[PDB]
Design a binder for these strands. Structure first.
Lengths: 222, 244, 196, 50, 138, 138, 152
RNA sequence: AGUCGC
């Protein structure tokens, strides 16, 4: 067996299930019933050549919904389940579709318009704004600019031009990883001034450009 | 502009009480520059969202949930020209929906709602930019507005009662040009009254006053109907031309 | 400013004697970003190359935005993925009980045979629409995004509403076929109900 | 008017004289006929000029 | 009996949390699917040509069995919910949430006309002049 | 005042429709079209547009030629409620004051008002920090 | 300019490869009327049947004869178009059309260069040409056009 | 440019 296999047991039982459409508020109420172990009861009353189905809410949860039956003949509805154990099973076929009708559509609306208002309120602010004077206080410089100054003002700034040999070693070390590099990268990896890194690269190496002044330098590989 | 004869220059039939009949320039731009009617109003636009919720809750079935091979009998419903769904009982829906409009659960000035029976379509419009006008409602072959509403309007001289209250009685409605095609509209209370076998009895709206079809400048000109029609158009230009 | 009403299909009999009828839909979310999208479904008439069908006056094609070449409506349906000819017929005309409607579409089905899968149909629209690109698959992905974003944008802007677009495009062909039977009035150019 | 009313009033023909005054509908249909005369003057003027 | 007069009444339960996601598998009635004649099925996400957004691939029985394509609905509901009402051995009702709505449609076991060759070119030449033979040359 | 029972006299004449018309202009007035649209334009549309969906983020390049550690910094900008102050004018002195349309015409000013917006800065980098968020009204 | 298209009420195409047992049992006596008509190559002519119905009112105005129309179409198309017609003794008027082939050469040599489109499909092109191009007494191209006037 | 004049 594998996770790509679909269990047909449900289908093999030919198990039928009911399909009911319900308004979000009723299911939201169920959503905050959590695990009370019920949300209501379903009542079915049958007569000669007629059937009446209805639902009653739990009185505790409230702190009559008639059902309208629906055609399913035009679609072969079925249900499958995607398990948290990553297992798939075909649970049953829809033998009936139906719609849960409100007890009153008319007065409800008062609540509904209010209901719509509660989910739907981007109170476009607009309340104008009278007259403001916060075109900002002007310090001596940007706060962050001072942060930038402080960073610049921490050790890094001047560079260690002294000791050519260690810098020579660093170039050799560059040559240990790859045959060519960007001079922008070469100053970054060496922490030395450009005019000097050039002065050295003139001494022990060569250069090679490509396309639009895109240049790389190499310690004369042989 | 400048060399092109056309039919969008000639006054069109639908411009009845929507755009002034005789108030467009006498130069080359004739009929292309029109002037709004006096009673005419223009929809400011609104979100379709509330209507979609009421419909789905009422009994509109969703598109991908239905079975295509079973829709021939059903009426297609559209909102802002977007095909939202289908319905198998459009007559109860239209009657109920208008009732909501009279009660203002959807904005009058906004929602236009039209049914094209011979095609089984229901178009609803809530986009900005539609030209519409106020009309009186008539019901059961007679006017729904009664003189008691008039006595409140006299009362306005010292009371908060207003034209908005009048719309809230649901005795007047707003009708855009697309919807105005499907109404049966009496010219004047007089005619809607005398009727027995005179013409018909199916009216649904009535005109608040027929001389309202004129635009701003055309209303200055007195007895405009005893004048030859282009004569009225020259006056609308010249009246606008006078000083004072 | 007076303009033509967005988001609504209307049928016209223009000058060009090779277009019998055409269905126009201007489809911007003016409440979105205000582009345009001007889908045309046009019914070709007068001709037939040679001994093809002795009457080409039913070869219904489709203009699409940013497409360098006219394509037959059926390709777009293939591109929506509904390969089943019965299903395309269901989107076009939900009353297959009338033989006359069924015959009216049939030569447009006959054209459809050269392309019979969504990917290749996408490769057709890509190459007929874009700059040349032998990448094939990108031509398919770009075209996929056009059908998603550019065509009838008022009906949606994502995968999750790709089905909804299929009915609406199909409704235009239906709205067009009705005029082509002539049991449907030809829509006026200047009716005020069709103004904004 | 009612749908399909070819009778002379719903479709064109005005009964009254300029002295009696035109009824509202009669008035508007007259303006349609007067517009043809205004437009034709402008269009004809350009074409003969050329 | 129910044919004359009957009344039934069953409690309805909602578990705080399901142990598995509940999904809908819809077919076209025109395909007249009968699971009675299914013996095996495989169901896997098509994913190789580029996971939980990706379409479904339904493979029935063996390789020679019918294959179907499953397409995800944009959302289960846009302003409501869909719930399954199920019969339990105690005699109650049990209600389960829908997590996804998928559309499933048929595919041909072996058709494939292909346009990559020069079918498009043949179209340039298409005077409705052939139909069978091109299907044979394949 | 009404009840629709003792009433027997619905009739109403010319004298009275003009009462209804007067009430239409008393409420609306002749230029209610222009004004209603502009008002809706501010009350809705300029808000709708900044409340769009283009929150911008920017990630500068890091670990050039070498780096390792942990941060290529990342910044995101968001926009909130929009404010509009009644139409103001600033003299060359710099001191703002209310404008009035008659003044605006004589001195040839433009009768406009200043617009403000709430902006957010949001430093959710690769790990070191995420909450440092600040609101502005600019 | 009267085209056959103006005169025609309707057209129908049937598969009726056995005239002696035609698909319209009511049509059967007219087949009895035609058996001396090339009986040897009825095994050679095509099995597809074209059937046309004509308006009596158009036929009266143009004061035509069925033999005039049959002679017109046969003459216009050529020997290939094998025509027979119903009896004049009816208020209705119908014409039955089959196509003859090239007989001897159709023995399938290389592959029969036609690309093997169905003969019926060729028949619709025949009917197309037949409606639009056929000009019985339609001596020219004057649209449909006429009227007659008395001048005093 | 648009408005406008005959």
């Amino acid at each position: 067996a594998e996770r790509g296999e679909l269990d047909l047991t449900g289908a093999k039982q030919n198990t039928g299930v009911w399909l009911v459409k319900v308004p979000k508020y009723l299911s939201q109420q169920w959503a905050k019933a959590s695990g009370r172990g019920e949300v209501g009861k379903l009542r079915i009353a049958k007569t000669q050549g007629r059937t009446e189905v209805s639902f009653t809410l739990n009185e505790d949860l409230a702190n009559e919904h008639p059902f309208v039956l629906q055609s399913v003949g035009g679609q072969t509805l079925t249900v499958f389940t995607e398990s948290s154990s990553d297992k798939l099973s075909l649970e049953g076929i829809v033998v009936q579709r139906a719609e849960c009708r409100p007890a009153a559509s008319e007065n409800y609306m008062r609540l509904k318009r209010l209901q719509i208002e509660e989910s739907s309120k981007p109170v476009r602010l607009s309340q104008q704004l009278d007259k403001v004077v916060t075109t900002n206080y002007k310090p001596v410089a940007n706060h962050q600019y001072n942060i930038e100054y402080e960073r610049k003002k921490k050790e890094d700034g001047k560079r260690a031009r002294a000791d050519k040999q260690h810098v020579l070693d660093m170039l050799f070390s560059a040559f240990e990883k790859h045959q060519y590099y960007n001079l922008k990268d070469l100053v970054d990896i060496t922490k030395q001034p450009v005019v000097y890194l050039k002065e050295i690269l003139k001494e022990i190496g060569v250069q090679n450009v490509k396309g639009i002044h895109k240049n790389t330098w190499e310690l004369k590989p042989e | 502009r400048d060399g092109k004869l056309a039919k969008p220059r000639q006054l069109h039939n639908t411009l009845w009480g929507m755009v002034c009949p005789a108030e467009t320039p006498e130069g080359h731009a004739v009929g292309l520059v029109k002037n709004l009617a006096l009673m005419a109003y223009i929809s400011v636009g609104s979100q379709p969202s509330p209507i979609l919720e009421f419909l789905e809750e009422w009994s509109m079935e969703n598109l991908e949930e239905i079975s295509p091979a079973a829709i021939a009998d059903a009426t297609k419903i559209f909102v802002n020209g977007c095909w939202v769904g289908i319905h198998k009982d459009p007559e109860q829906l239209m009657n109920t929906l208008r009732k909501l409009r009279r009660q203002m659960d959807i904005i009058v000035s906004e929602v236009s709602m039209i049914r094209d029976i011979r095609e089984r379509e229901i178009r609803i419009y809530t986009d900005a930019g539609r030209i519409c006008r106020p009309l009186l409602i008539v019901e059961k072959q007679k006017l729904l507005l009664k003189k008691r509403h008039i006595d409140q309007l006299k009362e306005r001289e010292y009371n908060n009662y207003s034209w908005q209250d009048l719309v809230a009685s649901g005795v007047v409605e707003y009708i855009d040009t697309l919807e105005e095609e499907t109404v049966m509209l009496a010219m004047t209370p007089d005619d809607l009254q005398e009727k027995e076998v005179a013409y018909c009895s199916t009216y649904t709206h009535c005109e608040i006053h027929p001389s309202m079809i004129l635009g701003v400048c055309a209303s200055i000109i007195p007895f405009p109907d005893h004048n030859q029609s282009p004569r009225n158009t020259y006056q609308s230009a010249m009246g606008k031309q006078a000083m004072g | 400013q007076e303009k033509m009403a967005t988001n609504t299909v209307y049928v016209f009999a223009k000058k060009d004697s090779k277009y019998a009828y055409t269905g126009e839909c201007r489809s911007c979310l003016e409440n979105s970003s205000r582009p345009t999208s001007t889908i045309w479904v046009s019914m070709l008439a007068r001709g037939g190359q040679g001994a093809k069908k002795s009457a080409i006056g039913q070869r219904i094609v489709a203009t699409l935005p940013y497409i360098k070449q006219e394509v037959p409506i059926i390709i777009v349906f293939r591109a929506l993925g509904f390969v089943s000819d019965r299903d395309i017929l269901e989107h076009i005309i939900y009353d297959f009980e009338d033989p006359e409607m069924m015959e009216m579409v049939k030569p447009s089905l006959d054209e459809a045979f050269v392309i019979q899968e969504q990917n290749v149909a996408l490769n057709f629209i890509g190459s007929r629409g874009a700059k040349p690109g032998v990448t094939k698959e990108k031509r398919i992905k770009y075209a996929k995004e056009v059908l998603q974003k550019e065509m009838l944008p008022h009906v949606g802007v994502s995968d999750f509403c790709e089905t909804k677009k299929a009915y609406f495009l199909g409704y235009m062909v239906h709205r067009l076929l009705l005029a082509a039977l002539g049991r449907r009035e030809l829509d006026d150019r200047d009716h005020y109900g069709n103004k904004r | 008017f009612i749908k399909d009313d070819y009778g002379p009033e719903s479709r064109g023909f005005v009964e009254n004289s300029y002295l009696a005054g035109l009824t509202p509908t009669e008035f508007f249909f007259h303006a349609m006929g007067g517009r043809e005369g205004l437009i034709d003057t402008a269009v004809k003027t350009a074409e003969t000029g050329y | 009996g129910p044919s004359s007069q009957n009344v039934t009444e069953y409690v309805v339960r909602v578990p705080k949390n399901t142990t598995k996601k509940y999904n809908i598998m819809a077919f076209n009635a025109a395909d007249k699917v009968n699971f009675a004649t299914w013996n095996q099925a495989r169901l896997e996400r098509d994913l190789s040509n580029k996971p939980e957004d990706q379409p479904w691939l339904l493979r029935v029985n063996g390789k020679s069995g019918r294959k179907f394509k499953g397409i995800k609905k944009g959302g289960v509901t846009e302003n409501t919910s869909y719930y399954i009402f199920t019969q339990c051995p105690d005699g109650a009702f049990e209600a389960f949430p829908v997590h996804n709505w998928y559309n499933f449609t048929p595919l041909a076991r072996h058709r494939t006309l292909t346009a990559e060759e020069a079918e498009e070119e043949w179209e340039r030449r298409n005077k409705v002049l052939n139909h069978f033979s091109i299907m044979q040359q394949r | 005042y009404d009840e629709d029972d003792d009433e027997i006299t619905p009739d109403l004449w010319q004298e009275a429709c003009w009462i209804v018309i007067s009430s239409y202009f008393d409420e609306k007035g002749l230029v209610r079209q222009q004004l209603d649209s502009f008002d809706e334009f501010i009350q809705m549309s300029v808000q709708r547009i900044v409340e769009d969906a283009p929150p911008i983020d920017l990630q500068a390049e890091a670990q050039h030629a070498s780096g390792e550690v942990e941060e290529p910094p990342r910044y995101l900008l968001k926009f909130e409620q929009i404010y509009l102050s009644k139409p103001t004018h600033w003299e060359r002195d710099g001191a703002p004051s209310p404008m009035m349309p008659n003044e605006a015409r004589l001195r040839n000013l433009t009768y406009s008002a200043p617009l403000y917006v709430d902006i957010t800065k949001t430093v959710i980098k690769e790990g070191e920090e995420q909450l440092q968020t600040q609101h502005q009204k600019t | 300019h009267t085209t056959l298209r103006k005169v025609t009420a309707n057209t129908a195409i049937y598969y009726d490869p056995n005239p002696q047992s035609t698909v319209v049992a009511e049509d059967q006596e007219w087949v009895n009327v035609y058996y001396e008509m090339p009986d040897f190559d009825v095994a050679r002519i095509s099995p597809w049947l074209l059937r046309v119905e004509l308006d009596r009112k158009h036929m009266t105005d143009r004061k035509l004869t069925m033999e005039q129309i049959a002679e017109k179409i046969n003459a216009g198309f050529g020997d290939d178009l094998n025509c027979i017609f119903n009896d004049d003794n009816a208020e209705k008027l119908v014409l039955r059309i089959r196509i003859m082939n090239s007989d001897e050469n159709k023995m399938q040599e290389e592959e029969e260069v036609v690309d093997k489109m169905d003969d019926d499909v060729f028949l619709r092109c025949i009917e197309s040409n037949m409606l639009t191009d056929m000009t019985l007494q339609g001596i020219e191209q004057i649209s449909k056009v006429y009227m007659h006037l008395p001048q005093t």
